[PDB]
Amino acid sequence: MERYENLFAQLNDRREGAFVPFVTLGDPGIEQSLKIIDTLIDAGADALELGVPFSDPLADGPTIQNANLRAFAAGVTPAQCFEMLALIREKHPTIPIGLLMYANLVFNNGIDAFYARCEQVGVDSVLVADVPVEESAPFRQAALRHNIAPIFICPPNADDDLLRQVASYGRGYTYLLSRSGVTGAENRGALPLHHLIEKLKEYHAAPALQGFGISSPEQVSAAVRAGAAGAISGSAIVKIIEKNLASPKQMLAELRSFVSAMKAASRA
Amino acid sequence: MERYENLFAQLNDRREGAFVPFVTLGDPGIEQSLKIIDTLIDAGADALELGVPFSDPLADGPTIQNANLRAFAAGVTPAQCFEMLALIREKHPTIPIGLLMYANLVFNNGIDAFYARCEQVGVDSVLVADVPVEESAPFRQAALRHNIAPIFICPPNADDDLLRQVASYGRGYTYLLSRSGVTGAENRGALPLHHLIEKLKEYHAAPALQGFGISSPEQVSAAVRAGAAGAISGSAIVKIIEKNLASPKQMLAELRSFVSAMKAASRA
Amino acid sequence: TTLLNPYFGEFGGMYVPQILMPALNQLEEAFVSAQKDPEFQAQFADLLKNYAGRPTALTKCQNITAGTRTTLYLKREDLLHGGAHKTNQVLGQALLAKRMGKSEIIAETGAGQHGVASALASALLGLKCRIYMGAKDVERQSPNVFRMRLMGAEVIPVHSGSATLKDACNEALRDWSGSYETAHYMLGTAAGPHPYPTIVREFQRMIGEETKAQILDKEGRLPDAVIACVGGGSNAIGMFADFINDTSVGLIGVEPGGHGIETGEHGAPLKHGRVGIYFGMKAPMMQTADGQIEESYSISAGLDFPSVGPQHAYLNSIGRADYVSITDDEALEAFKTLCRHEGIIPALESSHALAHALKMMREQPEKEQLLVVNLSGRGDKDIFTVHDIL
Amino acid sequence: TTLLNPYFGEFGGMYVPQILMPALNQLEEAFVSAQKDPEFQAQFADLLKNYAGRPTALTKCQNITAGTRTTLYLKREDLLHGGAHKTNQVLGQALLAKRMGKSEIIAETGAGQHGVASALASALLGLKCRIYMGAKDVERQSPNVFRMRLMGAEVIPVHSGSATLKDACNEALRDWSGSYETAHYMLGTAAGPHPYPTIVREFQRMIGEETKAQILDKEGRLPDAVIACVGGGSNAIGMFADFINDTSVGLIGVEPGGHGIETGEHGAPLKHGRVGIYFGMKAPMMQTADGQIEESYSISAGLDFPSVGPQHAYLNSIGRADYVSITDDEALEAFKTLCRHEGIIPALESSHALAHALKMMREQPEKEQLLVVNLSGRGDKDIFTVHDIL
Ligand SMILES: O=P(O)(O)OCCNS(=O)(=O)c1ccc(OC(F)(F)F)cc1
Ligand SMILES: O=P(O)(O)OCCNS(=O)(=O)c1ccc(OC(F)(F)F)cc1
Ligand SMILES: *Cc1c(COP(=O)(O)O)cnc(C)c1O
Ligand SMILES: *Cc1c(COP(=O)(O)O)cnc(C)c1O
Ligand SMILES: N[C@@H](Cc1c[nH]c2ccccc12)C(=O)O
Ligand SMILES: N[C@@H](Cc1c[nH]c2ccccc12)C(=O)O
Ligand SMILES: [Cs+]
Ligand SMILES: [Cs+]
Ligand SMILES: [Cs+]
Ligand SMILES: [Cs+]
Ligand SMILES: [Cs+]
Ligand SMILES: [Cs+]
């Protein structure tokens, strides 16, 4: 499929950036997570980035560590995540869906089989957080065989060789890291380096989404103004889940308000 | 004075051996210890061997260790022991009185001064348990200057050089050890080696008293028959004190019975 | 792109987030440079000799082998400063940190021995040390935690995941992914992403080099086998390295069997796990059917990790090394036997290696064999554990 | 009659019951014979090297002395098997026992280190070991008591007197006075009746011999002073012996000051006691006015004894060695300072010696001085004591 390509073409025609929330699948339970995701979409999410709970999420700070923990407390497994993904896609045919994976969950039981399942349920991209471009060959090859975009990360310090590799190897979107360290709203990153955003375009990279530390509408607006195609926010969204665990209706209301405000910032 | 010499001459004239009990001075208190000692004498003790409580009695087994402990629990000091000794001598002018000392109590505050105090209160002999003949010179010299007999020990294994030294250096009586180890009624020693008893007489040693493990009348009789001038018993006597702590009158009755029986065995 | 091969056959690699690749490349370059620098080598040798106490003794243990045709030597890493072999490689890694201009050290620890080793090296060499330790391990290891703090190290409990060693490993890498410009990550075993399996082997290889010289001096020939316990793999690869090309010399690694392999309560991924990707490496591991990292178990905390270094997986695959397991009870018996018959109190980790040598002897008592056990540490730390069981 | 001089000036001697004189004479004769026997010497040297780990390192401690004109080395007896210097002399005494044909060992212990050392040597060398320990010390030293039992030694609590070290000394001699035909008394320090002060010095003198060779190698000259703590006197006389005839080399012994000399709660008889006769020797001791043996005190159990070996009293009398004291608090500060600045955890005993060297430096920081501290043991055993105070 061409879900990201279609999305970015539509947004470009409207001079608009993408706003892409991250949540952990099955946090705080399967049913509530499905409602959360429908709320994100209804509030204006252009695409989704969805984490499969993993025992050892080494690129995530405490907020997302705790989301993984909540999902495990609810008994969430990767098989249940794929059932959720199929349902989400059946409700929402055009929204791009990206997974945030750790390598063992992809490799476990066969890399090719993992990407085949992604294709079956209608996932559009997979970002394997602990596979750098240097180790990426079997992942990116399997992704492409199954019509899945492999997503790669461009650090703010990326040298020319790395930019060329990310531009060549990735598809769908290019993940532009706002800073070093791990996920977290508590740590704000930098503005996209115009050198990076411009080199990526020079090398015909997939459109850039900036992520890590994006928690306010002003940062969304700023990312787009710097030349990124959009912005991803995770911890800020997951914190609303965490704060409102005891109040599921209030949780959805606050998620709706927050996403609406973040999406509004991406408009020209 | 000549108390041992006079005693042994009198006993020899009666074909009789000496019976010599040991007790710790001030066990279980000063007043009771004085009564104990008067009881021993009235029951037939020919001489006494009296211990001054010391913190570290390394030639004594548990029975006598515990006697020292009881005396310390009553606050008994060497100065109080010398007060007791003066009183005992004032009551009993002819009985030989021997002290069982450890070296530090003699050396502490001046060897000469210690033996001078012994002479003042009327002690006849001092046995310093942790001074072997090899270290004995200043002790034996001070003893003799103050008319005190220094007592030395003849182990059952004594070689000829040692027998000659003990015979030459000692006075009053020669202590004939019944066995190796430490004091205790729980461990019976051997019969005096006729070789030892005879060599001592050949070398004109002071008359022999056998000690360590003597707890029955038959052992007293046997020691005398083997050629010793008598026998010493400590732990057996001190055990009667220990057993009867709560019954001071019964204690004296049992001490009287025991000493009478032990002394009876020494008669020809 | 790397200077050295990051793989041992299929095992190893650099499975870290992209942001950490420059840190690994920088470390690899500094290591390659240091390995050619006689001044670095002389500094390292001087610390090993005058501070740590190398060379360590090789002790012949005659009482244990009486009445058999086994001759058994123990390589005495228990006598190294700190009481275990870990001191060797922390000194080398601290010197690499300084070579790179870094002022801070991050380390993970489970049993606490690596945390103590890191803290002592950092105290000596003027580095500011912070140590991650799973909260469950902090609770179990008060003596080591206090040692780390006495040495001036910051000990940071880790409450995420299972609050144990793998969780401390994750947290050390999270920290490093934001702090690499000023901090060096002092990984505690021959595992993790390249270049750590290589660096740790090279900074432990004096164990086997000395053993070779000592056994040639005493016996005039190489061992029939060298035997070492395998937690993450450092003491065993340090013993094995210099013998890999001596094809007659058996290499035997001993994984913890815990309550018994059949119970699933063990720490023996090399022979009983399956290949996965975790902690920066492709290696055998204990994992659930759907690929979550499992809980390992051993009576010995130093062996208690659900994976193993990639060079051991490789040496096993080609048949150059053989790997076996020893249960808690077998390790406890070996501990008691060495105390009573040789007057040496071995670490419970090392007792797994000794237990396997004792089995080699007892099963075939008329087999001629010259064995060396790597006695990786002393067992003072284990006397209460052993007490509380017996 | 003896083969060797039992006195050091007025101090020393053989103040034992007559029944024990043949045991002392037999031991002296066996020692004199062993000292001329190259086979005995080779056996002893082999155990020291291959079992105990000698030679021990001499470590320069630069961080502690920064900004002063003191150069400080530590002689690393903490790295000896067992974790203290005591191992040296127990190995030699076990070989003497075997030379005499004896199958059993008796030992006293207070802190428990000598009991452990005796037990390990007996385990190694096939001797049946029994250890006397005051009941109050048994209560305080569970870890060491368990080590002794793991090694196969019988631990016998002593309830007489003050139920502490002097009482265990007495009981060991009581036992020996009945068992000498089959048992050797392995006395734990350079004290007691002749020949023990001499034997223990000679079986510890490798400490100073190695120190001399190592300092000449590193500095090209002898130390200005060597500094050692003094419990009974063994580690200090072992360090001092080879320097006694090097008249330029200061010899400084450090007694425990406890809560302060003025409090009377200390273990400093050499400078603050008076001469007495106890434990087979004429030596300075802590005693009451009427000559009962007093209770000593130190935070460190290894220094906590109311007397001292006679050779130290003699070296003090002639001015060849100087003796000082260090309080509990000063020892604790030195312990913390070495941990944090050098990554070495010292025994609290040894920390008294280190504290005095630190004072020498701090009081006169522009004085040029090359110092060696004998680091007699490791301080793992003390971490809770230090913890419970801080
Ligand atoms: O808003 P924040 O700070 O919580 O950031 C949320 C990011 N969520 S995500 O799935 O895009 C995401 C993307 C990349 C990650 O790691 C990697 F860069 F190493 F690959 C981890 C998470
Ligand atoms: O009857 P027992 O077994 O209690 O023996 C009691 C002996 N009491 S004593 O004063 O003569 C006595 C004599 C000598 C002693 O030791 C020495 F030989 F080393 F000098 C100790 C006590
Ligand atoms: C930590 C430890 C081990 C296990 O670690 P490896 O890296 O496998 O060597 C083994 N022995 C001791 C004494 C340890 O402290
Ligand atoms: C026992 C001990 C001492 C004190 O004994 P000395 O005979 O005076 O040496 C000193 N240091 C350590 C570590 C000890 O174990
Ligand atoms: N748990 C042990 C050894 C260790 C450290 N890091 C490790 C990583 C993997 C396996 C074992 C380890 C210690 O901390 O001393
Ligand atoms: N108390 C210490 C040292 C020691 C043993 N015996 C002694 C006799 C006197 C003085 C000290 C000691 C120990 O047992 O390890
Ligand atoms: Cs905008
Ligand atoms: Cs008779
Ligand atoms: Cs053998
Ligand atoms: Cs393991
Ligand atoms: Cs200096
Ligand atoms: Cs002392």
Side-chain angles (χ1 to χ4, degrees):
Chain A
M1 304 291 285
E2 307 276 330
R3 298 191 185 83
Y4 288 103
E5 293 85 353
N6 291 343
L7 173 66
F8 288 127
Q10 288 152 10
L11 293 171
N12 182 63
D13 278 340
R14 300 199 303 267
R15 311 293 190 270
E16 189 163 307
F19 176 61
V20 179
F22 166 94
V23 296
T24 298
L25 289 164
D27 172 24
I30 293 176
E31 292 312 309
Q32 183 69 2
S33 178
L34 291 166
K35 288 175 187 168
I36 285 165
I37 290 162
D38 283 349
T39 298
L40 302 179
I41 293 169
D42 197 63
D46 292 301
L48 301 170
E49 192 76 25
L50 301 174
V52 173
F54 182 54
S55 55
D56 297 275
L58 84 159
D60 285 296
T63 298
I64 294 164
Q65 291 164 28
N66 280 317
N68 284 267
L69 270 199
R70 290 190 296 271
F72 281 124
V76 176
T77 62
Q80 290 173 356
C81 289
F82 277 105
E83 292 161 23
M84 289 179 70
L85 290 164
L87 294 172
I88 295 161
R89 172 60 69 212
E90 285 168 21
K91 289 184 293 190
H92 305 284
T94 62
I95 190 167
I97 296 173
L99 304 185
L100 184 288
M101 299 305 304
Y102 285 88
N104 201 54
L105 293 181
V106 177
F107 174 83
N108 181 32
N109 294 130
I111 293 175
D112 199 73
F114 180 85
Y115 290 96
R117 185 75 176 122
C118 288
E119 185 179 21
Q120 180 171 225
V121 301
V123 159
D124 301 292
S125 71
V126 170
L127 192 171
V128 191
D130 56 343
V131 173
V133 297
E134 290 84 350
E135 295 289 0
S136 68
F139 297 87
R140 70 183 190 252
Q141 293 157 0
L144 294 169
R145 286 192 302 272
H146 299 275
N147 300 304
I148 305 301
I151 303 309
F152 295 102
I153 310 291
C154 184
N157 40 297
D159 70 11
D160 193 62
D161 283 358
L162 183 55
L163 290 165
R164 285 182 189 267
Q165 279 181 296
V166 168
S168 179
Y169 290 172
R171 296 291 198 283
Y173 72 88
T174 301
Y175 199 107
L176 182 71
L177 279 175
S178 74
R179 51 159 175 83
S180 65
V182 297
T183 64
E186 67 267 31
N187 185 2
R188 293 197 163 200
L191 296 178
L193 186 62
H194 301 265
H195 186 86
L196 294 181
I197 290 179
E198 288 176 55
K199 294 310 284 193
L200 286 169
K201 292 174 178 176
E202 185 187 339
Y203 298 151
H204 304 301
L209 298 180
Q210 194 186 24
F212 280 40
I214 305 283
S215 63
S216 69
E218 192 159 37
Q219 287 171 287
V220 172
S221 201
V224 173
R225 186 162 59 250
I232 294 163
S233 180
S235 295
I237 302 277
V238 177
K239 280 168 71 173
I240 297 170
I241 296 169
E242 182 185 350
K243 299 330 134 57
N244 290 288
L245 292 169
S247 304
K249 164 182 56 57
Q250 183 171 348
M251 186 192 295
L252 300 181
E254 294 194 355
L255 287 168
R256 175 177 297 274
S257 290
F258 182 71
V259 171
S260 297
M262 296 289 274
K263 175 56 199 172
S266 75
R267 302 192 174 102
Chain B
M1 304 291 285
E2 307 276 330
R3 298 191 185 83
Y4 288 103
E5 293 85 353
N6 291 343
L7 173 66
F8 288 127
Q10 288 152 10
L11 293 171
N12 182 63
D13 278 340
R14 300 199 303 267
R15 311 293 190 270
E16 189 163 307
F19 176 61
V20 179
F22 166 94
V23 296
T24 298
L25 289 164
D27 172 24
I30 293 176
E31 292 312 309
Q32 183 69 2
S33 178
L34 291 166
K35 288 175 187 168
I36 285 165
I37 290 162
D38 283 349
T39 298
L40 302 179
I41 293 169
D42 197 63
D46 292 301
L48 301 170
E49 192 76 25
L50 301 174
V52 173
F54 182 54
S55 55
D56 297 275
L58 84 159
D60 285 296
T63 298
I64 294 164
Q65 291 164 28
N66 280 317
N68 284 267
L69 270 199
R70 290 190 296 271
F72 281 124
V76 176
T77 62
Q80 290 173 356
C81 289
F82 277 105
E83 292 161 23
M84 289 179 70
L85 290 164
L87 294 172
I88 295 161
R89 172 60 69 212
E90 285 168 21
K91 289 184 293 190
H92 305 284
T94 62
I95 190 167
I97 296 173
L99 304 185
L100 184 288
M101 299 305 304
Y102 285 88
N104 201 54
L105 293 181
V106 177
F107 174 83
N108 181 32
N109 294 130
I111 293 175
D112 199 73
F114 180 85
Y115 290 96
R117 185 75 176 122
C118 288
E119 185 179 21
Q120 180 171 225
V121 301
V123 159
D124 301 292
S125 71
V126 170
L127 192 171
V128 191
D130 56 343
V131 173
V133 297
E134 290 84 350
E135 295 289 0
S136 68
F139 297 87
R140 70 183 190 252
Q141 293 157 0
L144 294 169
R145 286 192 302 272
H146 299 275
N147 300 304
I148 305 301
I151 303 309
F152 295 102
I153 310 291
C154 184
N157 40 297
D159 70 11
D160 193 62
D161 283 358
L162 183 55
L163 290 165
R164 285 182 189 267
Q165 279 181 296
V166 168
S168 179
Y169 290 172
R171 296 291 198 283
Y173 72 88
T174 301
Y175 199 107
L176 182 71
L177 279 175
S178 74
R179 51 159 175 83
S180 65
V182 297
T183 64
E186 67 267 31
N187 185 2
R188 293 197 163 200
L191 296 178
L193 186 62
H194 301 265
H195 186 86
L196 294 181
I197 290 179
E198 288 176 55
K199 294 310 284 193
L200 286 169
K201 292 174 178 176
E202 185 187 339
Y203 298 151
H204 304 301
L209 298 180
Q210 194 186 24
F212 280 40
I214 305 283
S215 63
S216 69
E218 192 159 37
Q219 287 171 287
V220 172
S221 201
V224 173
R225 186 162 59 250
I232 294 163
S233 180
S235 295
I237 302 277
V238 177
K239 280 168 71 173
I240 297 170
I241 296 169
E242 182 185 350
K243 299 330 134 57
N244 290 288
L245 292 169
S247 304
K249 164 182 56 57
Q250 183 171 348
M251 186 192 295
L252 300 181
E254 294 194 355
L255 287 168
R256 175 177 297 274
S257 290
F258 182 71
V259 171
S260 297
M262 296 289 274
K263 175 56 199 172
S266 75
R267 302 192 174 102
Chain C
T1 304
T2 61
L3 298 170
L4 302 175
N5 190 349
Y7 279 92
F8 300 90
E10 77 203 76
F11 306 104
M14 296 170 81
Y15 292 94
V16 294
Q18 194 68 59
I19 195 71
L20 272 173
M21 290 294 308
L24 295 177
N25 282 312
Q26 172 193 44
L27 174 60
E28 187 199 48
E29 197 279 341
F31 172 71
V32 168
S33 180
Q35 289 291 86
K36 300 177 199 161
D37 180 350
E39 290 181 350
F40 182 99
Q41 298 307 313
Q43 288 171 262
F44 185 28
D46 197 285
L47 289 171
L48 293 168
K49 180 180 187 188
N50 299 307
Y51 178 78
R54 300 208 75 82
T56 60
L58 185 73
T59 304
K60 189 176 172 192
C61 292
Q62 297 174 42
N63 296 332
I64 278 181
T65 72
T68 79
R69 295 284 105 176
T70 293
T71 300
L72 177 59
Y73 286 84
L74 307 185
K75 180 56 172 167
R76 301 294 302 284
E77 298 300 299
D78 62 300
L79 297 178
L80 199 62
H81 177 55
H85 68 287
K86 295 183 160 78
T87 299
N88 297 315
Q89 75 100 5
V90 295
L91 293 168
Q93 285 204 58
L95 294 177
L96 288 183
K98 292 158 70 64
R99 184 180 189 88
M100 290 185 292
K102 299 183 183 197
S103 62
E104 298 184 354
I105 292 297
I106 302 161
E108 81 293 339
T109 197
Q113 186 63 207
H114 182 61
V116 171
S118 298
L120 70 84
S122 294
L124 180 65
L125 295 167
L127 300 163
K128 184 181 196 68
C129 180
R130 60 185 179 269
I131 299 162
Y132 289 102
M133 190 171 199
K136 294 177 176 177
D137 291 324
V138 169
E139 193 274 335
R140 292 176 199 123
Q141 306 290 350
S142 293
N144 280 338
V145 169
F146 189 58
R147 293 181 172 91
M148 291 177 235
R149 291 175 172 154
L150 280 169
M151 294 177 189
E154 179 179 16
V155 179
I156 304 170
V158 176
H159 296 278
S160 52
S162 44
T164 189
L165 177 56
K166 71 172 182 60
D167 314 287
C169 292
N170 300 336
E171 192 69 21
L173 288 170
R174 292 188 184 106
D175 182 335
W176 203 37
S177 76
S179 67
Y180 58 87
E181 299 273 36
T182 59
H184 174 59
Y185 175 32
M186 188 177 282
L187 207 161
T189 190
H194 179 76
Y196 288 101
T198 296
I199 293 175
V200 173
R201 174 190 74 225
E202 294 299 303
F203 290 170
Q204 289 291 0
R205 73 177 298 120
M206 65 288 301
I207 298 173
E209 291 170 348
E210 290 174 13
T211 296
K212 177 181 290 180
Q214 291 168 312
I215 200 79
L216 285 171
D217 181 53
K218 294 297 178 263
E219 297 287 338
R221 76 177 184 90
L222 297 173
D224 295 310
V226 299
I227 306 132
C229 67
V230 180
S234 70
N235 87 88
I237 204 73
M239 173 63 82
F240 293 173
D242 206 54
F243 295 106
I244 288 172
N245 296 339
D246 296 302
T247 61
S248 69
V249 179
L251 309 177
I252 303 172
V254 184
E255 307 191 276
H259 297 310
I261 298 303
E262 67 286 350
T263 69
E265 299 175 46
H266 62 78
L270 200 157
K271 294 307 287 294
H272 304 284
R274 61 198 174 81
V275 184
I277 299 166
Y278 166 62
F279 193 39
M281 58 177 185
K282 181 175 288 176
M285 64 201 8
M286 299 176 67
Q287 50 176 309
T288 65
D290 54 3
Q292 310 293 353
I293 309 305
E294 266 284 10
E295 297 221 275
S296 47
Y297 167 77
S298 176
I299 191 173
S300 190
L303 306 186
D304 194 348
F305 183 66
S307 191
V308 64
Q311 189 167 10
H312 291 293
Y314 174 67
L315 288 171
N316 183 51
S317 73
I318 66 172
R320 179 65 192 98
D322 293 322
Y323 297 85
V324 298
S325 67
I326 282 290
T327 65
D328 289 359
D329 283 350
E330 291 171 314
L332 285 162
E333 184 266 312
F335 178 103
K336 289 186 299 95
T337 291
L338 195 67
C339 289
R340 171 180 290 269
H341 295 281
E342 305 292 343
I344 303 168
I345 310 180
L348 281 170
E349 291 79 4
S350 318
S351 293
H352 287 74
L354 180 57
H356 186 71
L358 293 175
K359 178 183 294 186
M360 294 168 66
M361 175 186 73
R362 290 163 179 165
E363 288 185 358
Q364 308 184 304
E366 282 74 59
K367 181 182 182 176
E368 201 72 24
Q369 56 192 334
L370 174 58
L371 304 183
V372 180
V373 164
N374 199 26
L375 208 77
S376 56
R378 65 167 167 257
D380 302 68
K381 69 193 176 62
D382 295 309
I383 60 181
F384 305 116
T385 297
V386 178
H387 178 86
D388 291 9
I389 295 167
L390 312 163
Chain D
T1 304
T2 61
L3 298 170
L4 302 175
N5 190 349
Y7 279 92
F8 300 90
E10 77 203 76
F11 306 104
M14 296 170 81
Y15 292 94
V16 294
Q18 194 68 59
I19 195 71
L20 272 173
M21 290 294 308
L24 295 177
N25 282 312
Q26 172 193 44
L27 174 60
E28 187 199 48
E29 197 279 341
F31 172 71
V32 168
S33 180
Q35 289 291 86
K36 300 177 199 161
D37 180 350
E39 290 181 350
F40 182 99
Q41 298 307 313
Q43 288 171 262
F44 185 28
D46 197 285
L47 289 171
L48 293 168
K49 180 180 187 188
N50 299 307
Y51 178 78
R54 300 208 75 82
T56 60
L58 185 73
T59 304
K60 189 176 172 192
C61 292
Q62 297 174 42
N63 296 332
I64 278 181
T65 72
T68 79
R69 295 284 105 176
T70 293
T71 300
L72 177 59
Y73 286 84
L74 307 185
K75 180 56 172 167
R76 301 294 302 284
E77 298 300 299
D78 62 300
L79 297 178
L80 199 62
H81 177 55
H85 68 287
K86 295 183 160 78
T87 299
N88 297 315
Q89 75 100 5
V90 295
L91 293 168
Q93 285 204 58
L95 294 177
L96 288 183
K98 292 158 70 64
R99 184 180 189 88
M100 290 185 292
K102 299 183 183 197
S103 62
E104 298 184 354
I105 292 297
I106 302 161
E108 81 293 339
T109 197
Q113 186 63 207
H114 182 61
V116 171
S118 298
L120 70 84
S122 294
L124 180 65
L125 295 167
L127 300 163
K128 184 181 196 68
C129 180
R130 60 185 179 269
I131 299 162
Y132 289 102
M133 190 171 199
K136 294 177 176 177
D137 291 324
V138 169
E139 193 274 335
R140 292 176 199 123
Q141 306 290 350
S142 293
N144 280 338
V145 169
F146 189 58
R147 293 181 172 91
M148 291 177 235
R149 291 175 172 154
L150 280 169
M151 294 177 189
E154 179 179 16
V155 179
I156 304 170
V158 176
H159 296 278
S160 52
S162 44
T164 189
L165 177 56
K166 71 172 182 60
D167 314 287
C169 292
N170 300 336
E171 192 69 21
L173 288 170
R174 292 188 184 106
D175 182 335
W176 203 37
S177 76
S179 67
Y180 58 87
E181 299 273 36
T182 59
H184 174 59
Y185 175 32
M186 188 177 282
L187 207 161
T189 190
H194 179 76
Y196 288 101
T198 296
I199 293 175
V200 173
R201 174 190 74 225
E202 294 299 303
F203 290 170
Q204 289 291 0
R205 73 177 298 120
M206 65 288 301
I207 298 173
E209 291 170 348
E210 290 174 13
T211 296
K212 177 181 290 180
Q214 291 168 312
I215 200 79
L216 285 171
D217 181 53
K218 294 297 178 263
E219 297 287 338
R221 76 177 184 90
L222 297 173
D224 295 310
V226 299
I227 306 132
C229 67
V230 180
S234 70
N235 87 88
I237 204 73
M239 173 63 82
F240 293 173
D242 206 54
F243 295 106
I244 288 172
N245 296 339
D246 296 302
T247 61
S248 69
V249 179
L251 309 177
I252 303 172
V254 184
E255 307 191 276
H259 297 310
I261 298 303
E262 67 286 350
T263 69
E265 299 175 46
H266 62 78
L270 200 157
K271 294 307 287 294
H272 304 284
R274 61 198 174 81
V275 184
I277 299 166
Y278 166 62
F279 193 39
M281 58 177 185
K282 181 175 288 176
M285 64 201 8
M286 299 176 67
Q287 50 176 309
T288 65
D290 54 3
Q292 310 293 353
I293 309 305
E294 266 284 10
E295 297 221 275
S296 47
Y297 167 77
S298 176
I299 191 173
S300 190
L303 306 186
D304 194 348
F305 183 66
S307 191
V308 64
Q311 189 167 10
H312 291 293
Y314 174 67
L315 288 171
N316 183 51
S317 73
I318 66 172
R320 179 65 192 98
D322 293 322
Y323 297 85
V324 298
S325 67
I326 282 290
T327 65
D328 289 359
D329 283 350
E330 291 171 314
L332 285 162
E333 184 266 312
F335 178 103
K336 289 186 299 95
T337 291
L338 195 67
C339 289
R340 171 180 290 269
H341 295 281
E342 305 292 343
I344 303 168
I345 310 180
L348 281 170
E349 291 79 4
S350 318
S351 293
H352 287 74
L354 180 57
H356 186 71
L358 293 175
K359 178 183 294 186
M360 294 168 66
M361 175 186 73
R362 290 163 179 165
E363 288 185 358
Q364 308 184 304
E366 282 74 59
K367 181 182 182 176
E368 201 72 24
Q369 56 192 334
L370 174 58
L371 304 183
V372 180
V373 164
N374 199 26
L375 208 77
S376 56
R378 65 167 167 257
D380 302 68
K381 69 193 176 62
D382 295 309
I383 60 181
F384 305 116
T385 297
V386 178
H387 178 86
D388 291 9
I389 295 167
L390 312 163

